[PDB]
Scaffold this active site. Sequence first.
Site, mmCIF file in Angstrom:
data_model
loop_
_atom_site.group_PDB
_atom_site.id
_atom_site.type_symbol
_atom_site.label_atom_id
_atom_site.label_comp_id
_atom_site.label_asym_id
_atom_site.label_seq_id
_atom_site.Cartn_x
_atom_site.Cartn_y
_atom_site.Cartn_z
ATOM 1 N N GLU A 37 0.879 -1.229 0.080
ATOM 2 C CA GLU A 37 0.015 0.096 0.231
ATOM 3 C C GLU A 37 1.028 1.344 0.099
ATOM 4 O OE1 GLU A 37 -3.934 -0.603 2.115
ATOM 5 O OE2 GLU A 37 -2.243 -1.734 3.274
ATOM 6 N N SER A 74 -6.164 -2.851 0.634
ATOM 7 C CA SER A 74 -6.313 -2.422 -0.604
ATOM 8 C C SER A 74 -6.743 -3.611 -1.500
ATOM 9 C CB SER A 74 -5.158 -1.741 -1.198
ATOM 10 O OG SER A 74 -4.871 -0.431 -0.400
ATOM 11 N N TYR A 86 -9.070 3.475 -6.167
ATOM 12 C CA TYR A 86 -8.131 4.701 -6.023
ATOM 13 C C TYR A 86 -8.096 5.480 -7.228
ATOM 14 C CZ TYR A 86 -6.828 2.295 -1.858
ATOM 15 O OH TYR A 86 -6.766 1.381 -0.692
ATOM 16 N N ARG A 127 -12.243 2.778 10.420
ATOM 17 C CA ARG A 127 -13.470 2.393 9.366
ATOM 18 C C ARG A 127 -13.488 1.137 9.211
ATOM 19 N NH1 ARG A 127 -11.188 2.632 4.622
ATOM 20 N NH2 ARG A 127 -11.981 0.532 3.965
ATOM 21 N N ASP A 167 -16.058 -2.134 7.245
ATOM 22 C CA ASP A 167 -16.551 -2.418 6.081
ATOM 23 C C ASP A 167 -17.393 -3.480 6.267
ATOM 24 O OD1 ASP A 167 -14.908 -0.553 4.924
ATOM 25 O OD2 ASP A 167 -13.251 -2.033 4.688
ATOM 26 N N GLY A 174 -7.414 4.650 4.473
ATOM 27 C CA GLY A 174 -7.198 5.582 3.547
ATOM 28 C C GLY A 174 -7.527 6.944 3.829
HETATM 29 N N1 LIG Z 1 -16.478 -12.175 2.497
HETATM 30 C C1 LIG Z 1 -16.528 -11.342 1.304
HETATM 31 N N2 LIG Z 1 -17.720 -11.352 0.613
HETATM 32 C C2 LIG Z 1 -18.045 -10.344 -0.437
HETATM 33 N N3 LIG Z 1 -16.742 -9.660 -0.831
HETATM 34 C C3 LIG Z 1 -16.034 -9.656 0.121
HETATM 35 C C4 LIG Z 1 -15.692 -10.346 0.994
HETATM 36 N N4 LIG Z 1 -14.407 -10.233 1.397
HETATM 37 C C5 LIG Z 1 -13.856 -9.290 0.656
HETATM 38 N N5 LIG Z 1 -14.866 -8.681 -0.200
HETATM 39 C C6 LIG Z 1 -14.534 -7.787 -1.246
HETATM 40 O O1 LIG Z 1 -13.137 -7.502 -0.931
HETATM 41 C C7 LIG Z 1 -12.767 -6.211 -0.761
HETATM 42 C C8 LIG Z 1 -11.666 -6.017 0.158
HETATM 43 O O2 LIG Z 1 -11.708 -6.972 1.381
HETATM 44 P P1 LIG Z 1 -11.488 -6.460 2.647
HETATM 45 O O3 LIG Z 1 -11.952 -5.182 3.228
HETATM 46 O O4 LIG Z 1 -11.556 -7.593 3.738
HETATM 47 O O5 LIG Z 1 -9.828 -6.301 2.533
HETATM 48 P P2 LIG Z 1 -8.780 -5.124 2.589
HETATM 49 O O6 LIG Z 1 -7.912 -5.423 1.561
HETATM 50 O O7 LIG Z 1 -8.285 -5.028 4.024
HETATM 51 O O8 LIG Z 1 -9.586 -3.600 2.331
HETATM 52 P P3 LIG Z 1 -9.187 -2.030 2.411
HETATM 53 O O9 LIG Z 1 -8.737 -1.391 0.990
HETATM 54 O O10 LIG Z 1 -10.743 -1.773 3.071
HETATM 55 O O11 LIG Z 1 -8.106 -2.198 3.601
HETATM 56 C C9 LIG Z 1 -14.298 -5.879 0.000
HETATM 57 O O12 LIG Z 1 -14.389 -4.343 -0.035
HETATM 58 C C10 LIG Z 1 -15.250 -6.657 -0.902
HETATM 59 O O13 LIG Z 1 -15.642 -5.835 -2.005
HETATM 60 MG MG LIG Z 2 -11.927 -3.166 3.438
#
Ligand SMILES: Nc1ncnc2c1ncn2[C@@H]1O[C@H](COP(=O)(O)OP(=O)(O)OP(=O)(O)O)[C@@H](O)[C@H]1O
Ligand SMILES: [Mg+2]
Lengths: 321, 326
Positions: free
Chosen positions: B14, B166, B233, B272, B274, B293
């Site tokens: 990231e 990300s 992004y 934040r 999700d 972010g």
């Molecule tokens: N179990 C799930 N079911 C459906 N979509 C999912 C699931 N897990 C992840 N996603 C999709 O993948 C994206 C990223 O997953 P998550 O938020 O777990 O990871 P991250 O890489 O830590 O995200 P961030 O950029 O918020 O740090 C989610 O915003 C969603 O669109």
């Molecule tokens: Mg996320």
Amino acid sequence: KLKVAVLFGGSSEERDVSIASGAQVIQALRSAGHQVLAVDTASGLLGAEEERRLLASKVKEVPPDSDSLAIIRGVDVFFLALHGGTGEDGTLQALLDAGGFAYTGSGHLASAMAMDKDVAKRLFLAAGVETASWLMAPASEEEVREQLGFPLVVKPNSQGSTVGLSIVHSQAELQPAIELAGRYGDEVMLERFVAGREVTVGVLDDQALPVGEILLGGQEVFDYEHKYQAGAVREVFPADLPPAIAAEAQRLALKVHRALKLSGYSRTDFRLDEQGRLWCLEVNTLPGMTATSLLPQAAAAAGIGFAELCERICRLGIERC
Amino acid sequence: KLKVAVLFGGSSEERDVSIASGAQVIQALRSAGHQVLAVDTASGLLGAEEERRLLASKVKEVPPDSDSLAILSAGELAGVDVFFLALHGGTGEDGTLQALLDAGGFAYTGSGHLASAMAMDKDVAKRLFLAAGVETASWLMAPASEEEVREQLGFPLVVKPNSQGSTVGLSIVHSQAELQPAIELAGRYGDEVMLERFVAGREVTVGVLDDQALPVGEILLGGQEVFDYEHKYQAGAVREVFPADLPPAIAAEAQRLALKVHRALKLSGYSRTDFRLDEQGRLWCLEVNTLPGMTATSLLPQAAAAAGIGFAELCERICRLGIERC
Ligand SMILES: Nc1ncnc2c1ncn2[C@@H]1O[C@H](COP(=O)(O)OP(=O)(O)OP(=O)(O)O)[C@@H](O)[C@H]1O
Ligand SMILES: [Mg+2]
Ligand SMILES: Nc1ncnc2c1ncn2[C@@H]1O[C@H](COP(=O)(O)OP(=O)(O)OP(=O)(O)O)[C@@H](O)[C@H]1O
Ligand SMILES: [Mg+2]
Ligand SMILES: [Mg+2]
Ligand SMILES: [Mg+2]
């Protein structure tokens, strides 16, 4: 043969316990032929005379405290002979991670979780390990009477060595106990008191060691004096338990060790009620290694002498890192 | 007025997002009259010229490659009131840097060591979600056998690193044959790999600022299964709606759950969370971010603005919450 730096001392209320653990580990590793550096993290490397003096300094009847503690406040592997505070809660582990250094015990996340008694107990429940009801201060006395009742235990959420802990038998004892625990950290737990027997399970290299029992006599809790004064309490390894109860304590301890992502070794403490139920209090990632401590006795009952125990811990740390 | 050192960049995947977050924070705190030092943790303190150069760097459509990533108290930093952590992922977000700052007695923004380490460990965080009464999708950690996956998870499922950001390393697996390649992909990006049930439906997010929820946001994905690095992004790649067009009881529940998460993991300052909102109206918590972010396309600044909080004010408030905590 390894080159080991034994880090001990520190600035927690377990500093004297740590001096004693460090002194045993230093002596054992030297006896096994390793080169050993003795490092008091409060001052630095010690010479032979200071190091002989610390091997003779036994834990006192109260922990370092108040103004006394305020004043204090080519290596293959760092043996962490610290207890409590930044030496055990993941802070030092993260610093060593950042410097690329190999060290013993658990990593930074695991250490931080095991030190937070509240979080650890949530994880115990998630792993199917029974644990006593609890609240975190502040709790209205109304909520306390409603959810826990008396007697209950008040303890700092992140101490060791029974520092800051009280049994509270009635409402009038509750505030003074909370005040006391708050001198020793920022969060304070109120936990249902479990009457019964005091049991403990060491783990080494993802195997359980023989269960131990601490015979408290009439005492409700296992306190700082009885933990560290030679001869103060009888401690029995393997404990005189029905085999199914001992096996269940070992099964639960390994579930805890794995749930919190621990490494190397650990020691888990339980209370055993008269109905045969085990209640898990906590797990320790840097359990005591003093001449009165519990983990060396569990290892000895498994057929593992103390130098070998120390060596195996070193090698597990090197392998992890 | 404060003297703030904004730490950014780092060495996680990231890094480009962090450069953009750090550039935003630097300009916002300068607008508010604070003295701001820019520190790329991969190199050092930046001057006025290279600030313009490095900070103007835009997040690209793909994260930096593995090869590129493999490639305090000193002088100016004397008298810093607070270190604003504009890092994302890796040691910047997983508690490592927080512990280093703790050891040096420095004040910093966001959550402390334990809280940051837990929130980064998606598995542990989800155990805590359930302990707090916050719904979360079933999961297994790799390895998992064909029978375990078929019985408990089903297809499609999500494979993701346990500790990325990300959407780095994440795949949707539609059949058993796709599973191993997805696990191997995720394992290039960290040490543990999660297999999680896929939640079909809508994409929702809740910011928290000092124990208050911000307006809920929805990300409109169109046909897409997931919200990916490109769409996070690149400006205007997806619509992001704050406050979201949700039934009010659903939005209120998302805010209640986010606050429960923030408190359960002992977070501080801001966060934040999700969620996926399934087709039956039930919320499923994916994760919480302690260093979300802060780029010009990011979600948390838009949630703050919908609450009536401009970005400079948001950054100042975060600084003061960090100073108070430390
Ligand atoms: N179990 C799930 N079911 C459906 N979509 C999912 C699931 N897990 C992840 N996603 C999709 O993948 C994206 C990223 O997953 P998550 O938020 O777990 O990871 P991250 O890489 O830590 O995200 P961030 O950029 O918020 O740090 C989610 O915003 C969603 O669109
Ligand atoms: Mg996320
Ligand atoms: N809920 C409880 N019920 C009964 N006894 C308790 C309870 N909690 C603590 N104790 C008593 O207090 C002692 C210390 O408690 P605990 O093990 O939780 O703390 P510690 O200070 O971290 O211990 P250690 O020295 O093992 O690090 C226990 O060994 C036990 O005798
Ligand atoms: Mg303990
Ligand atoms: Mg104990
Ligand atoms: Mg994330």
